[PDB]
Nucleic acid binder design. Sequence first.
DNA 1: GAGATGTGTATAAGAGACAG
DNA 2: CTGTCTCTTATACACATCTC
DNA 3: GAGATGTGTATAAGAGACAG
DNA 4: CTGTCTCTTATACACATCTC
Lengths: 455, 455
Amino acid sequence: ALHRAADWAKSVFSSAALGDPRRTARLVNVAAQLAKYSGKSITISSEGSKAAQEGAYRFIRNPNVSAEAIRKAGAMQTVKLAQEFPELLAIEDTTSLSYRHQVAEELGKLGSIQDKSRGWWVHSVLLLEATTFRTVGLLHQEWWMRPDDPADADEKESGKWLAAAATSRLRMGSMMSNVIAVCDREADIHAYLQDKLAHNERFVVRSKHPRKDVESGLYLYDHLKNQPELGGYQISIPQKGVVDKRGKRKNRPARKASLSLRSGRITLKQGNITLNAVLAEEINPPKGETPLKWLLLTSEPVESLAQALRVIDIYTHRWRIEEFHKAWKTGAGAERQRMEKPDNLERMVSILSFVAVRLLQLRESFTPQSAETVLTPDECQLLGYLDKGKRKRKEKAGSLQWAYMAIARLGGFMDSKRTGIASWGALWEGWEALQSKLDGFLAAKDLMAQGIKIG
Amino acid sequence: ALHRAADWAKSVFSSAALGDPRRTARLVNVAAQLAKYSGKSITISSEGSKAAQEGAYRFIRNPNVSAEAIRKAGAMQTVKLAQEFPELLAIEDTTSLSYRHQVAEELGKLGSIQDKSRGWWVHSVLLLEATTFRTVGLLHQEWWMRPDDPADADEKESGKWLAAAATSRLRMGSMMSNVIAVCDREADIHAYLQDKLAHNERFVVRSKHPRKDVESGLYLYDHLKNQPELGGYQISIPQKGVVDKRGKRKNRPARKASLSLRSGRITLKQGNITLNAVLAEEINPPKGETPLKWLLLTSEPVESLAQALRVIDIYTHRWRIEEFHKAWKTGAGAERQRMEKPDNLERMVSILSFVAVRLLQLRESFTPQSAETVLTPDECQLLGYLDKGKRKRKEKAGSLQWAYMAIARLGGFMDSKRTGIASWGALWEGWEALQSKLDGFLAAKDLMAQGIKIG
DNA sequence: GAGATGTGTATAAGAGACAG
DNA sequence: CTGTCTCTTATACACATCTC
DNA sequence: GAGATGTGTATAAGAGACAG
DNA sequence: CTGTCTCTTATACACATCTC
Ligand SMILES: [Mn+2]
Ligand SMILES: [Mn+2]
Ligand SMILES: [Mn+2]
Ligand SMILES: [Mn+2]
């Protein structure tokens, strides 16, 4: 359980069909060093190793390596791990990778045709287990450049959703039935909803456009407001800093929001498709605040306050893909790379997508047992030494809850908002520190184990 | 020689007259943690220490702490260290500290009155020893905000140079005679040159404006072109990436530049002051390249090709203050701080000026003996373990030249341009890594020294 | 089998970045 | 303002690996 | 001497940042 | 798009330190 990075890389890319085993091999080593030195330049991850550095750069530049094949490999590993869960969540969303150095000119449009910043549009599908909600891994990804003139686009971007569904359906095979897609408003596309339904595929999409109900003859919102109040729930909206359109600074104070919840069956005109819907609307919202609300369409049953709370709960996790994105950028450093050719940059950033998931997964592994479960006796001992006189009586002596706060404490976590949760980023610094320290801890050991004055 | 940070902070700020010993004390601890965690947030530097974090923030916010007094303290330490060198270089230049968060509005103007980015203008005087050219430390600093309307400025910014000279003359006292000021073109101000001369103060300033010579009746450049060619020298201009006004990308290839050198005495109209001058002009410059040239005014003698090469050499180091600036920002993170009040931000960034010099000094300490001279036996051993099988036959077994490349190699240095020199930044990562590892190395030791299974 | 493609070592140098 | 390096890309040689 | 100012611990929350 | 935390700032209490 030490140099996980190395074992990790192997389990993820060992099946990579790069057309040549040597390529597949190099892929696994490149990944391992990147994973070990998360968010660091290839150079640093090489550990002064010229043959390594040269091996890496040669790989992301090798005209024989399909960035798709790489991505494909990582996905297959996800399918494999998926085989052990009863219910899976497939978060689906899009993000952009933006660059401003020479290679930008050969990249697609992200904003205004005159905008210097250009890059790629990526549509990913991150898998989770609907039980404890842990990140299984990346199931699919679609990369594409947006032309300056839409009249040149080979296809409408909106079809991405149907694209994702297609590949997802192909890779997960008989496990699709255990999958529940989760997408934001932009997914409100009857051509999508129709598809999923045609395949008995489960899903949970948020409503954007006002639609009508065949029977009710009303707008979904108006038809659901009539259904009996199944009950409700509450959420604590945390305080944060905000930035208005003007560019100034507005504060969003904390406040507990009470919500009313309803549910029912709707039917849309096109394809005359039928499904259930849920409408969650805030309760007595503050004067200077917009009344919180959600209206989700889905195949999942919602006849009971519990079955509906399940839908609200599932959709609440869609935000995981947002954290994935931050991990892919600020984390693994996708937008920090400076390759000078499209294919090259794609090859690097493609590997980093997986090196981005791992950061998430790392924090989750230390989140609910004992430390000996994930940590090795050596590092577990060192962490204990380092964390000496810093643990709260709230945590056991050597529990999986202690290691969390100990590793996190290395990362600098001071629980400023006293919430207990530490950012995956602070938990990573800790892991990185602990491991770094483990080098010296194991070094002193190796020398004393062969007889040598260490002080 | 271990937790230098701690001893360091003490030697620099222990004399700080913050009006209360407790304040002075806190100052030293705050510095020590910042120095230990260079370029990191106060939080991280606190090592999970609530009483520390709270102590730091309380300090940079304490209405009783004069940011000047802090700076003053660090300067006095410089004067002290200066006492051991025959000849000192006082590089003088200005830089700006720019911020874009709310506190900006209360800060001075850096650009256009409408510009969001605002902050401070700082005029520093960094001391060096004219022999080996090591960084002694910060001798003076002037902080000031530029008003939106120049009609409100209490004084002309141009007088800063005379300001710096005044304080420098006051703190260095009888050691001013061993000092040589070094300033770029913007210092071409007869009111300055006149001052220094009036105080028998030495200096080396680059020429900007065309001036005439009382005798020669010519322009300095034209009067020096007549003097006999004292000889010359060569310099290797290193390849780099450049950015044109248009914003594109132009390459500046490497090339050895041959220069012709002359010298003579000039005399300006105002105050009818007299001094020596040196004119170094390139030789057979490339078609698409501007003919390199320097014309420096100074009190230092230049009658011989050696005495003149000394002036060219001295002025060549003025660029050290440019590295200081990068160290103050990208390094210590001056522009990364987010204090919400002017005085507060000043107090933090003021401390960081010194925590910025140390990064420079650190790289210099490992630059030309043996490692045992700077490194402790413990860390020296660990570095050797870590650097096992990575040293070139070019470096001794355990020399002060080996540690350099070993520590640097930890930092990732791969000598891409094969120049041998490593950035102070890469040498810092190494030092940081080594020390981090030293924690585990010393931990395993402490436990085995008391009998405990370490594997 | 005959002809590429990757590995380690070396040598050079364009692109980038941050500070002028 | 005479910059200082680090990140990326190639090329070449002697072998070691693979593909068609 | 009488009256502040800093230290450690605790409790809360506005500002910032990066991704929507 | 129902965000998630980390960086900065205060306040209060019981003492420990300092200043005028
Ligand atoms: Mn979206
Ligand atoms: Mn200047
Ligand atoms: Mn400058
Ligand atoms: Mn999104």
